[PDB]
Design a protein around this ligand. Sequence first.
Ligand code: NAG
Ligand code: NAG
Ligand code: NAG
Ligand code: NAG
Ligand code: NAG
Lengths: 194, 594
Amino acid sequence: TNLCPFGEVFNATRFASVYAWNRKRISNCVADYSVLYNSASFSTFKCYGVSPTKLNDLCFTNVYADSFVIRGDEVRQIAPGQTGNIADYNYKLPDDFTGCVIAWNSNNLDSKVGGNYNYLYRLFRKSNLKPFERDISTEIYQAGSTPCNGVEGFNCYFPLHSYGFQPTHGVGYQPYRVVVLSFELLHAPATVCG
Amino acid sequence: STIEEQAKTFLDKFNHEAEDLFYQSSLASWNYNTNITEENVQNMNNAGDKWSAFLKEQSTLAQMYPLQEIQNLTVKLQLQALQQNGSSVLSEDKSKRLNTILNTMSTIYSTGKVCNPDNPQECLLLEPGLNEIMANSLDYNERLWAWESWRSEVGKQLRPLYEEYVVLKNEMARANHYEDYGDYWRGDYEVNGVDGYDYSRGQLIEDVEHTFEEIKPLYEHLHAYVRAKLMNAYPSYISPIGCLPAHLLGDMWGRFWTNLYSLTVPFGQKPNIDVTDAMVDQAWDAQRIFKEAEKFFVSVGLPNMTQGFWENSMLTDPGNVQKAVCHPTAWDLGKGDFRILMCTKVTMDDFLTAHHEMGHIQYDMAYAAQPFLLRNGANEGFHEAVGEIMSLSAATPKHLKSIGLLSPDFQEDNETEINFLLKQALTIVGTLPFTYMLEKWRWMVFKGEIPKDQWMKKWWEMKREIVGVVEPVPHDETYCDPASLFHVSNDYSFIRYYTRTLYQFQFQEALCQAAKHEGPLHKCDISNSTEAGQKLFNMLRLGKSEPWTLALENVVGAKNMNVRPLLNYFEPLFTWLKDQNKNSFVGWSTDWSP
Ligand SMILES: *[C@@H]1O[C@H](CO)[C@@H](O)[C@H](O)[C@H]1NC(C)=O
Ligand SMILES: *[C@@H]1O[C@H](CO)[C@@H](O)[C@H](O)[C@H]1NC(C)=O
Ligand SMILES: *[C@@H]1O[C@H](CO)[C@@H](O)[C@H](O)[C@H]1NC(C)=O
Ligand SMILES: *[C@@H]1O[C@H](CO)[C@@H](O)[C@H](O)[C@H]1NC(C)=O
Ligand SMILES: *[C@@H]1O[C@H](CO)[C@@H](O)[C@H](O)[C@H]1NC(C)=O
């Protein structure tokens, strides 16, 4: 009956780092995507497996909103079948992705003079991620054969680095807040519709 | 697992760390350059020291990745560019002495001041005192005084310093398995391990000598005509068959010959093209000039400037309140921050410089996708050549007539393009023999093909066989005349300018042979020709990921410095010079001296 809490997902001030993206679940409510479609301030509103129009008149059992902040030149990697640092190490979208990727420039908040080093991406991983699997584990990355013993050294690297977000960065390096909606269907009755 | 994957991971980490720290260092240096304050100097020096220390540490951690076990070529290029340890390969004492010599050279050059033979207290520096003396005085004796005084004040001061500099840089270079420091510098044009596109470091010397041999007729005709004009401007002070005086070449050291234009113009009555008046008459400003240059670049399909360029670049002097070092410079601060710093006065020269610096920035945007170590010109001469071809295209009367800064009432008759070509040759064909000779002498010094006591004895020897320049007064060996140059004193490679001059005309001929331009080459206008724009962008986007020979062939179709485009560009001028010089002795005799 109530309006699905999309606002607090979008109105929020703190988005996660891409490596530790936030998952929020939306259910048991009537969802209004009209503001999402007609906002026209998003710099990337790409819907996969569903059309922007018909999704409003469509029923789902669960929605997941994955919030994080990335570069602009990496928003393309938030798309099914893409390959890169963000796609493989940090956040993986499945090939059969059935949601909408939304991304807006946020150079004003998420970038400050001297660098905003609060947003981290996982620069290295042993193996590429699976769909919708989070990897916050911060073991030292062993490039070579010698073990690291939890210290920095040859072939041994910290698996997290930070976008030194600054307001004067280029548009591809400017921070971009990305909310990824993923729609799900089960045998249980649908709860996200209207 | 393998060494190659480990090196790939190492360079993956280095890319991000270097991007961050280089952005910080360049941002601090920018904030200083726009606002000269001592706190800004502190920020700049802190960030620069951080960057240098990070480079040293990463070079150390990179040297434990052997190159002989890398099969990838981009990774090999990055590792080679990172593993060169530089002065760190030397011991601490000798390295500190070397850095001391470098800083003493920089200070001696940048602070030396010459004084009149009567007023030793109130006197003048190189800039703008000696600068204006050389660029405006028609007095032979004043120029001779300025020249001899500056050569015997800064050159003599730097001579033992230059001896120590050379003999320690040989140690530094051979410690990196280089034949000399000259070989170390030529290691920029060197390509290895690519079949059909290799380039040895002596191959560069061969190519430069060959291209200069081909130029020598055109340069010699230009030199003869200029000598005739200076005959008519200085009757008794030049021989009719000899060379030119050193001090009397429009500049302190004869690098450019532009300041002879007024004394050598072919047709003084014809109005030289100058749309500065047509700019002030339409109330053009710096923003208008840079918007016009951006529109020109969009015409050839290259992307327009980023919004950050308009927001953050200093396109105009911020009044007299805050002082800035505003030599027009293009700044790729990294991470998408492209800027131009220039005190823009509304002028045709500044219009051309705006096109030049926007060409630099456009080239910088092109390879902004290459890994951090590969974000530079294919070699040292590509970046300024890509910058220069745009000024060439914009200076053409067709572009000016099309942009509304030149009235269609203007008529082009043989006289005006002869004037244009002579201006262009004084700028360009004047500096080629000087640059080639200076780098020849420097490489001979670094290799050791010259005993030290024979430096000047050989240096002013080759002036007579290469450029056609005599010393106004004899010099002993305590002189170090070349150090009077900004680049010889301050440890810079000077052949980048010769290579740049060749590549720019190669690029121009290639582009407006792909632009279907019919007519003389000096009328080459690339505007509205998206085909030439795409042709050049294909070269630009490479950075130095691919060999410079292959990148050059990507536009010209040749793997080497083709001198033919320059001669073709100056063909009308070359014919006119041949016609003009029939009553003069072309060729110079080395024996005559002042
Ligand atoms: C959060 O701010 C946005 C402004 O773009 C807008 O949706 C609204 O003011 C806030 N959200 C809600 C649900 O009110
Ligand atoms: C120039 O630098 C001084 C010292 O840091 C600073 O007070 C001033 O605001 C700067 N000027 C501008 C325009 O920022
Ligand atoms: C060399 O490495 C790059 C990435 O570092 C890779 O894209 C390229 O395919 C490699 N070269 C070859 C021949 O595989
Ligand atoms: C450059 O031109 C493109 C072409 O559509 C345009 O989208 C862009 O806004 C232009 N750049 C600026 C800064 O206006
Ligand atoms: C380029 O083309 C446009 C439109 O065709 C024209 O207005 C402009 O004058 C042309 N400029 C040049 C330099 O050819």
